[PDB]
Amino acid sequence: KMSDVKCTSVVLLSVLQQLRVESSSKLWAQCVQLHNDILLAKDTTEAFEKMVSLLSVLLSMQGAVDINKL
Amino acid sequence: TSAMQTMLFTMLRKLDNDALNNIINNARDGCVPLNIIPLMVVI
Amino acid sequence: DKRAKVTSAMQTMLFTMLRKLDNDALNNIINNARDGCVPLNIIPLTTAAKLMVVIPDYNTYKNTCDGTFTYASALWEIQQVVDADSKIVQLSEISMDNSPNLAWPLIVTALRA
Amino acid sequence: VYRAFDIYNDKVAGFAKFLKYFVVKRTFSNYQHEETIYNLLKDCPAVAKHDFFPHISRQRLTKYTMADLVYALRHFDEGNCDTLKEILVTYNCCDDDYFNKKDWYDFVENPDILRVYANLGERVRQALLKTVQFCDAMRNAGIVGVLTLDNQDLNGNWYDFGDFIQTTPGSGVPVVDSYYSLLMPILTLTRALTAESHVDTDLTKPYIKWDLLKYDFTEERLKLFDRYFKYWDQTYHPNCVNCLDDRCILHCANFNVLFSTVFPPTSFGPLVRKIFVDGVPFVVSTGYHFRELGVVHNQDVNLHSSRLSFKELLVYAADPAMHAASGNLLLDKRTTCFSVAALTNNVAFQTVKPGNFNKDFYDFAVSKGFFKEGSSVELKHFFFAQDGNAAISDYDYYRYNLPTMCDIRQLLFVVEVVDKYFDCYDGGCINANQVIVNNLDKSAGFPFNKWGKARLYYDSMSYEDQDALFAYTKRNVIPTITQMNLKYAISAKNRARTVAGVSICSTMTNRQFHQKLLKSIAATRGATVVIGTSKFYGGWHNMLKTVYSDVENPHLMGWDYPKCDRAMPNMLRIMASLVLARKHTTCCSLSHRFYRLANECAQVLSEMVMCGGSLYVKPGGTSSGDATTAYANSVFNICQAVTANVNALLSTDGNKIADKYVRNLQHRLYECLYRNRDVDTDFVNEFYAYLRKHFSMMILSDDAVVCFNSTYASQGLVASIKNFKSVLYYQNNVFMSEAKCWTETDLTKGPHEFCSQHTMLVKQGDDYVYLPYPDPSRILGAGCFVDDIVKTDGTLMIERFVSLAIDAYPLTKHPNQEYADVFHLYLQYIRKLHDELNTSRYWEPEFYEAMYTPHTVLQ
């Protein structure tokens, strides 16, 4: 389970950028660093923990895409 | 543009990891965090 | 056609640059040369009336833009600090403890005094 | 023990290591001769004390001479470089434990070594002064002889007066070609002329408060020349306008590069004047002060004009004078590069988005058995996103471009050999109605990209306007601006990728200058430079059998250029531009060619670059947005290879070369490098033919494969990879690691990697041919991720996938089954995509096979 978490991180940062997270320089820098560290991950649990960290900044943010309906 | 998040969550459920599924199950009913998870939860 | 458009655009840009340059400092610098011919890198250096300091970290804010600062053998006073997101960061906000809370880098805009 | 010697006699010639405080030595006649010559040169303060008692005992000298230092710095090898370390330690330039750090010798990693080497500079310049003093004695005592670096110790003193002869007083002449020429590359390395920045040339006093308005410094340049290079027997022009030939231009620029590192950097760049256009004072450039070419004053300077023409409008818009003067002052603390002016009220930030993951092809691939944990072919190529402070972190990389001075006698012959390498293409100045325009949608640089693309300006300027602008450029200097931007590209590394948009006023004339030459190099097959030769229809096989042509004991070799586009010195780029312009012997006078060289040096070498939202100064390097960078890089590559071959043929002991033709070639090479200033076309052709015979190169832009006679390179008669390492270390200020340099002994296994591709021999059509195949993981990456442009039309996605399958076809012959699985997967996917929408149907395997056979040689 390595390519799947990598494409998941790709689409996750795609969504994050789509939600204008790039308007917060610090938060966007954090997201970019986590994405680039996932795309160079050569192990699965580190990729998974960086992935849940990167998903945090998506589901901690409110006014974003809803989650109770999905 | 709303289908991007739907397919993202499809891929996320395809991953089926304990941490990710736990976080999504929590955030389902509002129990979300506030800051980035370190390597501030409410309700 | 579009040649006329680009001529008008170049003229307008040249004029918006032209009507913000001439002053006593520019002539006082140019008329002290051999035949009125100075380098280019010194017209914005000792003639300009506003400086923009791009401070990436708090240390380069201490040693450069302390609460007046002298640059280009002149006198400026730090003012109108602005972070990466273009938010007016009051000089009180820029401290040692509260530095990670504001999005670096800062942009200080100082008038010539 | 081994010591570096510069030797030239009837039996040997070269600069090589041969086996031999208060040095003691041993002929009666030679004893009396040296005694008399010393007695006549006794009072000079540059001579070391000599004791004639039978022996000739010299006193108070160092352990290593300046020859050992020049060798250690010009033949560097991190494995065996203990002499350089001992020199650095002994003279308090660093400590011993400094060499326990990793990559200390590297310039990119750990640039603090530029602070250790610099701690020799003063010492170096001291010796220089001693040199002049010494020669004065020999000009006042009537002494004729040649100055060898192995006679001056590291404290500056001299000895060993055996070669000299007694002559008439006041007329003795020293010859200092080899001495100064071998010292030249290490003058800038150690920053020898730093103490000239201080008031009375003392490193314990403040810098000269140079008048800000001062720009010429010509008198100070001549003073420095006469001070350190007094006995250099060649007319030196401080402004390279006065030269007589491009060799004079190179010769004088090589000195101006060294002399420009003592003046304030605010005095270089364009020189500006206040002219009156229809009554209003504009500020426009009426000159330029190049660090390399001195001061150039434009000839057509028109004041009190009534109205402007479109060409004049382009020269004024591209004129940074109106932009840098009428902007705000900028102190940019993010980089150490010289910052000129912020043209906006707030610094802009630029970001890069992630890749657009195509999920369809990925699920297809996983259904076709791919992406298993434990598979040999992976997904390794992604679109990396970049944050705001990325572009500037890219621009700061130009801190790897340093001022580099070259061995002028070596370069003046390497340039002849390189021109021989290009002596088969056509060239010359073409008109405006003959230029062939590629990518009419390229960026037109700042401030031209505010109103349209290059297409816009090409369709607005009539042919007469382009001709008038070319003529203008042939008499005046136009210091245009470029605009740097971040690039959306696939890579296996997360580094920022940038493209530089050069203004239209520069490319429009660089094309009229170099178009015929570039087209002639692109339309020729079988030369050393392979640019515009498609790998399709046997092209790869033909190129390989051309490199294989007649080498006797063939081996294969390759190398990389670390930080090539950033650290290429300005001297070598000027050399490359002159080699390219050498075709203009019937379309341009000498002044025309110098004004073209100055235009190019201002536009693509040390121009002003608008990064972020402001204007900074570019210290050097190549601009990827220029049409002529791919060929200037090939010229630079050929120069480096010929230089490595020269330093391999010279630095080998000519007394162990069991051949006679090779030993005579080395002797004549020394005679033609540091003697016989006039070029010897016969020996130039001889060396060119020798290289073609025993060292056959295949070179595209900063990429090279070499088939070399292994038995010669085993003895040193031909350049090896350590020679390229040494040459890149002392000429390019970059370290080349042998972890990225490959050598191949079997010619059935072709070049391990050339142009980012691999080679293997396959049996095809009852004939064994060399086929190129790419890294499969890269093609999988390019297939799974797109750049968010094909999502609106399926035709472009189908075309990208067909191109990937074309590129992927040869893996069907690879022995690894999973590799042919890649092409079969691509073919299945493209058949699907075609179902969604005989040798011309892109949905059958015989459309791709025919792309790789010379029996179907169409496009």
| Residues with Cβ within 8 Å of residue D405, at least 6 apart in sequence | D184, D185, D187, D188, D254, D257, D258, D571
Contact (Cβ atoms closer than 8 angstroms) between residue D611 and residue D484 = yes
Tell me how far apart the alpha carbons of residues D723 and C60 are, in angstroms, rounded to a whole number: 43
Tell me how far apart the alpha carbons of residues D381 and D804 are, in angstroms, rounded to a whole number: 14
What residue type is assigned to position C104 of the chain? W
What residues of chain A have any CB closer than 8 angstroms to a CB in chain B?
1, 4-5, 7-8, 11-12, 14-15, 18, 27, 30, 48-53, 55-57, 59-60, 62, 65, 67-68, 70
How many CA atoms does the CB half-sphere of B13 hold within 13 Å? Answer: 7
Q: Do chains A and D touch (3 or more CB pairs under 8 A)?
A: yes
D824 annotated ligand-binding residue: no
Residue D116 lies in a domain: yes
How wide is the angle at C-alpha D748 spanned by C-alphas D744 and D751, nearest 5°?
45
Please report, for residues A61, C56, C106, the alpha-carbon distance to residue C100 in angstroms, rounded to integers and kept in the order given. 20, 12, 12
Strand partners, D341: D329, D615
What DSSP designation does A51 have?
H
Helix, coil or strand: residue D211: coil
Contact (Cβ atoms closer than 8 angstroms) between residue D515 and residue D435 = yes
Experimental method: cryo-EM
Domain segments of chain A as ranges: 1-70
> The tokens 């040798």 sit on which residue?
D839
Q: Alpha helix locations (H) across D334-429?
A: 359-367, 391-395, 408-421
Please state whether the peptide bond connecting residue D264 to the residue before it is cis, i.e. omega within 30 degrees of 0: no
| Residues with Cβ within 8 Å of residue D499, at least 6 apart in sequence | D443, D484, D485, D487, D624, D625
Quick check: A14 and D356 CB within 8 A? yes
D784 annotated ligand-binding residue: no
Tell me how far apart the alpha carbons of residues B2 and B32 are, in angstroms, rounded to a whole number: 21
CATH number at residue C44: 3.30.70.3540
Tell me how far apart the alpha carbons of residues B24 and A67 are, in angstroms, rounded to a whole number: 8
Q: What is the dihedral of CA D565, D568, D570, D574, to 10 degrees?
A: -80
- Nearest Cα to D807, choosing from D791, D794, D826, D821? D826
Contact (Cβ atoms closer than 8 angstroms) between residue D149 and residue D8 = no
Contacts of B35 in chain A (CB under 8 A): 60
- D143-146 and D174-175 strand pairing: parallel
Contact (Cβ atoms closer than 8 angstroms) between residue D539 and residue D547 = no
Structure tokens at C63: 């040693």
Structure tokens at C13: 């840009």
Which chains, if any, share at least 3 CB pairs under 8 A with chain B? A
Structure tokens at C94: 């820029």
| Residues with Cβ within 8 Å of residue A38, at least 6 apart in sequence | A5, A6, A9, A47, A50, A51, A54
Backbone angles phi, psi at A24, to 5 degrees: -110, 105
A66 CB neighbour count, 10 Å cutoff: 9
Please report, for residues C38, D288, D307, D634, the alpha-carbon distance to residue A53 in angstroms, rounded to integers and kept in the order given. 56, 54, 63, 47
Contact (Cβ atoms closer than 8 angstroms) between residue C56 and residue C68 = no
D163 CB neighbour count, 10 Å cutoff: 14
Tell me how far apart the alpha carbons of residues D96 and D92 are, in angstroms, rounded to a whole number: 10
Q: Is the dihedral of CA D224, D229, D233, D236 positive or negative?
A: negative
A67 CB neighbour count, 10 Å cutoff: 16
> The tokens 């085993």 sit on which residue?
D714
What residue type is assigned to position D646 of the chain? V
What residue type is assigned to position D633 of the chain? N
Is residue D171 less than 8 Å (CB to CB) from chain A?
no
Q: Alpha helix locations (H) across D439-503?
A: 454-460, 463-473
Contacts of C103 in chain A (CB under 8 A): 24-26
Q: How many domains does chain D have?
A: 2
Structure tokens at D234: 């060649």
**Residue of D320, D346, D388 with shortest CB distance to C40:** D320
Q: Which long-range contacts (CB under 8 A, 24 or more apart) does C10-18 make?
A: C10/D313, C10/D314, C10/D316, C10/D317, C11/D313, C13/D317, C13/D447, C13/D450, C14/D282, C14/D316, C14/D317, C14/D322, C17/D322, C17/D323, C17/D326, C17/D327, C18/D280, C18/D282, C18/D322, C18/D326
Quickly list DSSP for D706-771: EEEEHHHHHHTSS--HHHHHHHHHHHHS----TTS--EE--SSS--S-SSS-EEEEEE-SSSEEEE
* Angstroms from D616 CA to nearest CA on chain C: 10
Structure tokens at D229: 């290079």
D429 annotated ligand-binding residue: yes
Q: How many domains does chain C have?
A: 1
Residue D459 lies in a domain: no
- Nearest Cα to B36, choosing from D327, A33, D739? A33
Please state whether the peptide bond connecting residue C105 to the residue before it is cis, i.e. omega within 30 degrees of 0: yes
- Domain, as residue range, for D791: 758-852
So which residues of D are the catalytic ones? 701-703
Q: Alpha helix locations (H) across D429-528?
A: 454-460, 463-473, 504-522
Contacts of A22 in chain D (CB under 8 A): 351
Element holding D220 (H helix, E strand): helix D218-228
Tell me how far apart the alpha carbons of residues D259 and D264 are, in angstroms, rounded to a whole number: 11
Backbone angles phi, psi at D539, to 5 degrees: -50, -40
Quick check: C2 and D459 CB within 8 A? yes
Element holding D683 (H helix, E strand): helix D681-694
Give Cα D546 distance to the centre of its chain. Answer: 26
Element holding D290 (H helix, E strand): strand D280-290
Which chains, if any, share at least 3 CB pairs under 8 A with chain D? A, C
Resolution of the experimental model, in Å, one decimal: 2.9
- Nearest Cα to D368, choosing from D827, D811, D805? D827
Tell me how far apart the alpha carbons of residues D338 and D349 are, in angstroms, rounded to a whole number: 19
Strand partners, D295: D289
- Nearest Cα to D145, choosing from D158, D156, D135? D135
Structure tokens at D150: 């192995």
How many CA atoms does the CB half-sphere of D666 hold within 13 Å? Answer: 30
Helix, coil or strand: residue C37: strand
- Nearest Cα to D627, choosing from D601, D654, D597, D604? D604
> The tokens 């280009």 sit on which residue?
C72
Q: Is the dihedral of CA D68, D74, D75, D77 positive or negative?
A: positive
Contact (Cβ atoms closer than 8 angstroms) between residue D181 and residue D408 = yes
Please report, for residues D646, D661, D669, D761, the alpha-carbon distance to residue D665 in angstroms, rounded to integers and kept in the order given. 11, 6, 6, 37
Please report, for residues D151, D455, D571, D648, D724, the alpha-carbon distance to residue D68 in angstroms, rounded to integers and kept in the order given. 11, 57, 25, 17, 20
- D758-763 and D768-773 strand pairing: antiparallel
Backbone angles phi, psi at A46, to 5 degrees: -65, -40
Quick check: D379 and A28 CB within 8 A? no
b/e map of D416-448 (b: 16 or more CB within 10 Å)? Answer: bbbbbbbeebebebbebeebeeeeeebbbbbbb
What residue type is assigned to position D731 of the chain? Q
Cβ burial of D780 (10 Å; 0-12, 13-18, 19+) is buried
Tell me how far apart the alpha carbons of residues D464 and D471 are, in angstroms, rounded to a whole number: 10
D50 annotated ligand-binding residue: no
Tell me how far apart the alpha carbons of residues A2 and A16 are, in angstroms, rounded to a whole number: 21
b/e map of D329-347 (b: 16 or more CB within 10 Å)? Answer: bbbbbbbebbbbbbbeeeb
Q: Is the dihedral of CA D298, D299, D300, D302 positive or negative?
A: positive
Backbone angles phi, psi at D764, to 5 degrees: -135, 120
Residue C95 lies in a domain: yes
b/e map of D210-238 (b: 16 or more CB within 10 Å)? Answer: bebbbbbbeebbeebbeebbebbeeebbb
Give Cα D87 distance to the centre of its chain. Answer: 28
Helix, coil or strand: residue D553: coil
D11 CB neighbour count, 10 Å cutoff: 9
D650 CB neighbour count, 10 Å cutoff: 19
**Residue of B5, B29, B35 with shortest CB distance to A60:** B35
Best interface-test mutation with A: which of B1, B2, B5 has the largest number of A CBs within 10 A? B5
Contacts of C37 in chain D (CB under 8 A): 215, 271-273, 286-287
Element holding D140 (H helix, E strand): helix D121-140
Residue C33 lies in a domain: yes
| Residues with Cβ within 8 Å of residue D343, at least 6 apart in sequence | D323, D327, D328, D610, D613, D614, D615
Tell me how far apart the alpha carbons of residues D151 and D163 are, in angstroms, rounded to a whole number: 11
What DSSP designation does D389 have?
B
Tell me how far apart the alpha carbons of residues A2 and A51 are, in angstroms, rounded to a whole number: 12
Please report, for residues C26, D194, D433, D458, D467, the alpha-carbon distance to residue D462 in angstroms, rounded to integers and kept in the order given. 37, 51, 10, 8, 9
- Mutual orientation of helices D121-140 and D218-228 as an angle, nearest 10°? 70
Helix, coil or strand: residue C39: strand
Contact (Cβ atoms closer than 8 angstroms) between residue C36 and residue C30 = yes
Helix, coil or strand: residue D332: strand
D101 CB neighbour count, 10 Å cutoff: 13
What residue type is assigned to position D515 of the chain? Q
Tell me how far apart the alpha carbons of residues D100 and D97 are, in angstroms, rounded to a whole number: 5
Q: Do chains C and B touch (3 or more CB pairs under 8 A)?
A: no
